[PDB]
């Protein structure tokens, strides 16, 4: 058995890792819009943001997406 977590992103070097959470959460929905729903890269992005973001942050982000208050293009 081996446990898989979010890899180290070179783009996010600081100790505060909120931006890594946000960018992975947004890359998931960008992958979902562009390359279908069942592409392996989209699952990689989904497991990547689920591994980093607190659950309260994510559920606040889907309620902002459902209310229409998400500033992303997609």
């Amino acid at each position: 058995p081996e446990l898989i977590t979010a890899p180290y992103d070179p783009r996010f070097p600081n100790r505060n890792q909120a931006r890594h959470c946000f960018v992975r959460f947004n890359e998931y929905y960008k992958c979902l819009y562009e390359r279908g729903e069942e592409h392996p890269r989209c699952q990689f992005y989904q497991k990547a943001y689920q591994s980093l973001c607190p659950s309260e942050w994510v559920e606040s982000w889907q309620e902002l997406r459902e209310k229409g208050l998400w500033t992303g293009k997609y």
Binding site: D9, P10, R11, F12, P13, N14, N16, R19, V23, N26
Partner: protein, 78 residues
Amino acid sequence: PFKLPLDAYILMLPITYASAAFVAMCCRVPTADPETSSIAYYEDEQKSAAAAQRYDNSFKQFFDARIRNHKVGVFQNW
């Protein structure tokens, strides 16, 4: 006000060092990775990874050989 004593220049060397370090630290922050007011900065993954790795390497690459050698103390405690 008076003649600067031979001490005061030996004081002024690390004081000048600390002031130059402070100025360089304040100057390099607007040339760092998280100081971008856009989400479209991170959609170019090659440039952003290069910039953030350059922000990692500087002032840390002087210490890599002694981090690998565990030179974490003045003495040698095993």
